[PDB]
Each structure stands twice: as structure tokens, then as C-alpha cells.
């Protein structure tokens, strides 16, 4: 039974360094190279490089040579291998999920991958969200949609409920995107009947458990 166990999610400020481990076990470890990959939201897998277990010899692309260093650590009876990836000077676009994988053969087939570790490069400490209303100023039929705006918070996640959990029909909560400021921001909209405005109270409930922030907001044009 071969399993590659990676470290837990790490949040690091830009300029500083980060270490991503990968506990390899359950096979003839020395005979197979361990490669690293990183995954930015969407896009495609990006090759970080491989490392020779027995030798320690790394191989990185020029875009990483200097900032990254691949090392390893053996165990007692070598039943446990710790593969470390160190990234020195972190920047904005270094924010991704890194994948520790195993090169099985010369075909470059990777059969065993790690669960991955979320590396988020940001220096926002811990802040609550700023809830802003979404309403149609001019009534041009729009069958009608409105919502709230979760802005500038850290870190994930934020639970959004409408009318204290009553309204679920047509409710769309969007996945948060990390801004360039190092703060998360999502929005949640719901489709409401055109004649429901005025004769119905619409209240959104934004919850940010990390910073212990819960805000109720009422939206109407």
C-alpha cells in the first residue's frame, strides 16, 4: 500500500518562505523519482521539478531555479521518506495547490499523487468581511435578481444564508476569488419575483467564523 501524505494548508506572507512536505511510504522508495506540480485556480498543471531520493539531485525549470530547493530525509529502516519543497521568495502568483507525485516508469506516468496543500500567499492577517448591497437603481424588468457582496476578508470561508435560511430557491453563492490585495471576495445573488419587492423583506446573512463576524443586511432599491 503506497501513500503520499502532504502537509496541511499553509498561509504565508509575500517575500517569506514556505515548506511543503510529502511523507512517502509503502514501496521501494529509492527506485522512483518524486516530482512536484503546482495548480493555480483553473489553468493547467505546472511542472515544479523532480528529485532523486537516493542522491538528492533536484531538477527545476529556470523559472524556479533559485527560489526553490528540493530536499529529502530518510528514516530508520527507510520505511518513511520525507520530501521537502522549499520556496524562498514568495510572490503573488505563487498562490496555488502543490502536488507531490511519483514517477513510476520512464513513460513519466504518475500513479500516486498527494492530496495537495493549499499555499496562499497573502499578508492580510485576519479581518472580517464588508457586506455591500446589490440593487437595481433603474427598474427595467431585469424575473428579478439581487444580492449581497462579501468584500475584503481573510481567510476562508464565508457561509451565506438568505432570510435566515428560509430562501433556498434560485440562491447562487459564488466561489470566492483572491484579490490582488491579498483579501478574499465573493458575491451571492438570488432570483426573486418581479412583484415581490416592497411586499417582501429580503435579508442576507453573511458569516465569517474565523474572525467571528456575522452581519445581517437588508437590500432594496
Amino acid at each position: 500500500q503506497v501513500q503520499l501524505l502532504q502537509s496541511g494548508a499553509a498561509v504565508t506572507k509575500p517575500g517569506a518562505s514556505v515548506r511543503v512536505s510529502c511523507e512517502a511510504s509503502g514501496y521501494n522508495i529509492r527506485d522512483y523519482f518524486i516530482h512536484w506540480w503546482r495548480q493555480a485556480p483553473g489553468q493547467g498543471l505546472q511542472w515544479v521539478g523532480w528529485i532523486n531520493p537516493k542522491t538528492g539531485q533536484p531538477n527545476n525549470p529556470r523559472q524556479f531555479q533559485g527560489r526553490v530547493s528540493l530536499t529529502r530525509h530518510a528514516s530508520w529502516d527507510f520505511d518513511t521518506y520525507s520530501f521537502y519543497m522549499d520556496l524562498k521568495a514568495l510572490r503573488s502568483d505563487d498562490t496555488a495547490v502543490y502536488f507531490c507525485a511519483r514517477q513510476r516508469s520512464d513513460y513519466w506516468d504518475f500513479d500516486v499523487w498527494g492530496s495537495g496543500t493549499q499555499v496562499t500567499v497573502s499578508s492580510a492577517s485576519t479581518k472580517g468581511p464588508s457586506v455591500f448591497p446589490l440593487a437595481p437603481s433603474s427598474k427595467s424588468t431585469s424575473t428579478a435578481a439581487l444580492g449581497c457582496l462579501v468584500k475584503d476578508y481573510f481567510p476562508e470561508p464565508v457561509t451565506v444564508s438568505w432570510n435566515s435560511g428560509a430562501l433556498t430557491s434560485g440562491v447562487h453563492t459564488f466561489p470566492a476569488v483572491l484579490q490582488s490585495s491579498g483579501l478574499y471576495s465573493l458575491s451571492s445573488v438570488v432570483t426573486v419575483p418581479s412583484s415581490s419587492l416592497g411586499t417582501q423583506t429580503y435579508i442576507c446573512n453573511v458569516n465569517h467564523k474565523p474572525s467571528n463576524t456575522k452581519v445581517d443586511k437588508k437590500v432594496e432599491p
Binding site: 525549470p61 530508520w76 513519466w108
Partner: protein, 343 residues
């Protein structure tokens, strides 16, 4: 009249049972004296296929040399993760002796004659020798301290050039001298004039299979001191010469420009004899006694390189020194041989 097979080959030698050095000592109670007149049944019009990277002869040579270093140059304390050992660590004469390897009756070793043969694929000119030519087993990373040279043009050896995980072996044409001394903190000495000419022509061959790109040479990308730093063994002393200024140049437009900090028209690599050594043979660390008192000098002639191409996307391929696995050294000598059963 013949086919490929596997056999427990035996080694031939020109050693002597009266010498102090551990090589002659071993090569007498482990090898059989040379012929020294082997028959060269050379014939043309017959094509055979070879493969230096999946060759059975290499593993056998790897085995005997393993037993050599283990029982000869004996350390003081070894560590095997949970079980250490303590023993006597005597200093001794350590200078390699050229060895041969031969096939028993019913078997035969096929020899290619195409001096431009890379290491894989077919070969037009074949021959048959019962044994192999004189080969000096020298354990060394990055550089090949002692070996043969093709009188023809420079040949590049790799299991796959497209595969950056495959170590590249460069078979030169001209000899380059290297001197490492310890006066009475060590250092090597390499002639920049020759070194520039060599890397000039190496690039011409590297730019053959990778035409559009500008070839570079950067120091090792990291790892153990044995692999990053050009490590070897002279008279039983484990030398580690910093190569950061050895591989530091760029080849473009049929011309090579070297940085390298040549302070006197000669490349100087700061060496250092270590006593804590990551063993290449078995997995573990072996400790040794401090060097001998006096001069420690051996004049070597590098005949090959061990490089690894960096993968990724820039119309410019950078090459860093590699090695580690000592099988590769003996593949650059046994590339022209193969075991074949007569039956």
C-alpha cells in the same frame, strides 16, 4: 549462429599478488591473469543492436567493485539506520588497476566497431573477443577522472535526450589534464585554454540535437555534497572539490564564453578532504581518519562528462553536472560490448 543471453562473467587482470595496494590484492584473489593474446574475429556485413543503459555486463562490474571498496578501504564507523558498527580503520595504498571482463565457453562478447556509435541502436561493424579491453574502474562524480577516448568526433550518450531525468554522458575526443594536490584545504588545477576548447566542441555536439537553443553550463542544482561537489578518491582520501567555477559558461554562435574566476589563466577548484562520507555502495554514512601527512597529488585526465539538462520552457538549454550512480561510469566503457550465447 548466436543469440543474446545473461551469464555470470569473470574478470581478467594484469595485476600482481606482490603489491601493497588494495587493488592488486583484490584483483588476484578475484581475477584471472590476461591472455594477453585474444583473437579478433572481425567481420563486416553483419549488423547487431546494442544498449548501454540496459546492459547486463554493467551490473556485474558494479558488484565486484562494490565488494572491493567494502573490504579494501575500510572506514572506522558505519551507520545503517538502527545498527552501527565499529572496526579498525587502517590507511592504505589506493590506486586503481585496469580490469577486463570475459565470457565463458559457449558464450561470446560482441564488439561494435563504429566509433561514432552513441550507445543505443544498430551497428554495421561487428567483432568477437572472449574478453574486454583494459578498463580502469574510477569512481568519480561529474567528471570521469580516467577512461578511454574516441579518436573520431565527440559522441553524446543518453538513454533518452528527450527525457531530462536521464543522465547524459559525454564522450570527448581530446584529453584534459587535472591536478589535485595537498601541500605540507586542498585544490585542483585545470588548464583554461584546453577547457575552453573542450566545452567549445561539446557545445557543437549538444547543438546538434538541440539546434535552436543556446547551450549553458551552471553548477549543480543542489543535493548531497557528493553529487553537488565533484567528489573522488585519491590514495584513499575522499576529496570534495568545489565546482561552482568549473561549470560557469555559455556557448552561442559556435563560440563559448567562460566565467569561472580564473585568477591566473588556470581554473582553481577549492578541494577539501572529508571524513564523513555518504557511501555510494551501501545506504549509510562511513567515517574515516584524517588524511596522511605530506603531499597528496594525482595527475588525472578527464575523458567524459556527466550532465543533466533542465526541463521547462526558453530556447536556451542549461546543463548542470550530475552522476551519483557509479554504473554510468562503466557504461561509457562497456557501451561497445554485449553478452551473446553461442550455443
Amino acid at each position: 549462429v548466436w543469440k543474446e543471453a545473461k551469464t555470470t562473467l569473470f574478470c581478467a587482470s594484469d595485476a600482481k599478488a606482490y603489491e601493497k595496494e588494495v587493488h592488486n590484492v583484490w584483483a588476484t584473489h578475484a581475477c584471472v591473469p590476461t591472455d594477453p593474446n585474444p583473437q579478433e574475429m572481425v567481420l563486416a556485413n553483419v549488423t547487431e543492436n546494442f544498449n548501454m543503459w540496459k546492459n547486463d555486463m554493467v551490473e556485474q562490474m558494479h558488484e565486484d567493485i562494490i565488494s572491493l571498496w567494502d573490504e579494501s578501504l575500510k572506514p572506522c564507523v558505519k551507520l545503517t539506520g538502527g545498527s552501527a558498527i565499529t572496526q579498525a580503520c587502517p590507511k592504505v595504498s589506493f590506486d586503481p588497476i585496469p580490469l577486463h571482463y570475459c565470457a565463458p565457453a559457449g558464450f561470446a562478447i560482441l564488439k561494435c566497431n563504429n566509433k561514432t556509435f552513441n550507445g543505443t541502436g544498430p551497428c554495421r561493424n561487428v567483432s568477437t573477443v572472449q574478453c574486454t579491453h583494459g578498463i580502469k574502474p574510477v569512481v568519480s562524480t561529474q567528471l570521469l577522472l580516467n577512461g578511454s577516448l574516441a579518436e573520431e568526433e565527440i559522441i553524446i550518450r543518453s538513454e533518452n535526450l528527450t527525457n531530462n531525468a536521464k543522465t547524459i554522458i559525454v564522450h570527448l575526443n581530446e584529453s584534459v589534464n587535472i591536478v589535485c594536490t595537498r601541500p605540507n584545504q586542498a585544490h585542483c588545477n585545470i588548464n583554461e585554454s584546453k577547457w575552453n576548447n573542450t566545452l567549445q566542441k561539446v557545445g557543437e555536439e549538444l547543438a546538434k540535437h538541440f539546434p535552436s537553443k543556446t547551450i549553458k553550463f551552471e553548477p549543480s542544482s543542489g543535493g548531497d555534497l557528493e553529487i553537488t561537489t565533484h567528489s573522488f578518491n585519491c590514495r584513499g582520501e575522499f576529496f570534495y572539490c568545489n565546482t561552482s567555477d568549473l561549470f560557469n559558461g555559455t556557448y552561442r554562435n559556435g563560440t563559448y564564453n567562460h566565467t569561472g574566476r580564473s585568477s591566473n589563466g588556470t581554473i582553481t577548484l577549492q578541494c577539501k578532504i572529508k571524513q564523513i562520507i555518504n557511501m555510494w555502495q551501501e545506504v549509510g554514512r562511513a567515517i574515516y581518519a584524517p588524511p596522511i601527512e605530506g603531499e597528496i597529488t594525482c595527475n588525472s585526465n578527464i575523458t567524459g562528462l556527466l550532465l543533466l539538462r533542465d526541463g521547462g520552457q526558453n530556447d536556451t538549454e542549461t546543463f548542470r553536472p550530475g552522476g551519483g550512480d557509479m554504473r554510468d561510469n562503466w557504461r561509457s566503457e562497456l557501451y561497445k560490448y554485449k553478452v551473446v550465447e553461442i550455443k
